[PDB]
Design a protein around this ligand. Structure first.
Ligand SMILES: Fc1cccc(F)c1-c1nc2ncsc2cc1Cl
Ligand SMILES: Fc1cccc(F)c1-c1nc2ncsc2cc1Cl
Lengths: 276, 276
């Protein structure tokens, strides 16, 4: 397709990773005169999509194989973990590599390295854990041996980890914060613009909501260094959400999104912050 | 710079208009599987900012001349008018031409043509009125003959109009909608994410707030064909917005944005809709 030809990317030599670069646009930058986390997350999704496209997945339910489509099987995000050392500026060229390895029998892990292409310096990295689910029962699966063959051709056989260090913050359990929470943002409702292709509430919306929970004093004086998010439930368009946070100039916060009425958990998270 | 070498864009020969093309990315497409209005608005900003950059304007300012810098002056939208005939799909390429001509001495008019990249068929167009504003006082300004000298070199001598037709919808005055209004979206609040470099509410957010007021039946069964938005008074980060609309297979809405507390008008608008 024309987009594959023109895009600033391509499969890498071994064909087991994808690389694409993006010119940071003027509207992508926030109060810190640099790319918002939302922007970064979007680009993580874009390169993930384009990787899938380039190995022959026919953009249906994302990353679904020919058999998965037939057996009504999909990939759902259990965890996202983003770490940014340095937010890029308007007009910077950011290179992002992404690839996918097996994650035992439960599902799949997608990683990302984020470079400033000019310097070649790593400005961020990211890792994510996904699980196979029957889209009809919404119930988890041992990854069929049929499916594994279809996708593992396009994955490195031996570990490639964006986070290869020992007790990696990326795999740390997140506990439920104790109510009442130090900070809260109450009665949040998805806006229309927050809804994706398939009418699900966008990952960037969950990110936004986590930040809404943070005290003005911290965002005025600090920048987000890491975010971790575990997803339990999809938030419906008319659902009403309370976003909570507590602590646990370099600070961490525990997060928790629940439904205002039910009290039911939508997600929980952790965010680390650096001083400006 | 590397960004300009990699952008699908360039000044035209004459140095009086700028053209840049875009691949519609995965997260830029809404429920209709086509680019959102928020993406198209964003793209119109980007191509305008890159035209500024291309004739030697610096960063930290959209088209703010050497003097404007010194006086702490910026450009703000008085009126936006967009028309889309066809929304590009995920993966499609659109070319946008943009240029800027003078609007008496109250300010400047920026216009856009949107074409399909391959064919060069017109799928959309836009025009806008901008006025100078002190970025600190947030107060509108007499356009200096000093600043006119600095920019007028890069504006075509004789009118170029994206809307060359006679009694153009783009120039028609917008009446006050009669309250109480058919449709409403109350207690809207700027998100942290809506705030730009300088800490004020993005142009695109006001468009979103207008679409929030339209009934679900319409968005489910129709596409936005045109929008006219007047910006009368700014939304502050701490302000709360009520967004109103009424009617007046092609349907129109009169719009009105006011502050929940004051009852102060910030914006008034028209939207024209086509059936999917
Ligand atoms: F898109 C892919 C191209 C090549 C190899 C892969 F493993 C994938 C893939 N990426 C995923 N990302 C999140 S779940 C998921 C599942 C798969 Cl099969
Ligand atoms: F960017 C520009 C490049 C070239 C010529 C111009 F006149 C501009 C310009 N464009 C604007 N667009 C909205 S306000 C505004 C003001 C100016 Cl001075």
């Amino acid at each position: 397709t024309l987009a594959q030809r023109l895009r600033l990317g391509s499969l890498e030599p071994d064909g087991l990773s994808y690389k694409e670069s993006f010119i940071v646009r003027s509207y992508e930058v926030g109060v810190n005169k640099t790319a918002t986390v939302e922007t970064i997350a979007n680009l993580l999704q874009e390169v993930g999509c384009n990787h899938a496209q380039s190995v022959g997945f026919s953009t249906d339910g994302f990353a679904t194989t020919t058999t998965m489509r037939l057996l009504r099987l999909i990939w759902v995000t259990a965890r996202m973990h983003i770490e940014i050392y340095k937010y890029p500026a308007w007009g910077d060229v950011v290179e992002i590599e992404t690839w996918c390895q097996e994650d035992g029998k439960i599902g799949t892990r997608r990683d990302w390295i984020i470079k400033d292409y000019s310097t070649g310096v790593v400005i961020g990295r990211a890792t994510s854990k996904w699980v196979m689910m029957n889209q009809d029962t919404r119930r988890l699966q041992r990854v069929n041996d049929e499916v594994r063959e279809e996708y593992l051709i396009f994955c490195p056989r031996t570990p490639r980890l964006a986070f290869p260090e020992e007790d990696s913050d990326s795999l740390k359990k997140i506990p439920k914060l104790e109510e009442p929470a130090q900070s809260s943002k109450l009665g949040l409702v998805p806006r229309r613009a927050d809804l994706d292709m398939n009418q699900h509430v966008n990952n960037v919306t969950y990110i936004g909501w986590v930040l809404e929970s943070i005290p003005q004093e911290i965002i005025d004086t600090h920048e987000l260094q890491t975010i971790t998010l575990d997803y339990r439930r999809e938030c419906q368009h008319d659902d009403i959400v309370d976003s909570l946070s507590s602590r646990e100039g370099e600070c961490q916060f525990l997060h928790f999104l629940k439904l205002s009425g039910s009290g039911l958990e939508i997600n929980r998270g952790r965010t680390q912050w650096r001083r400006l």
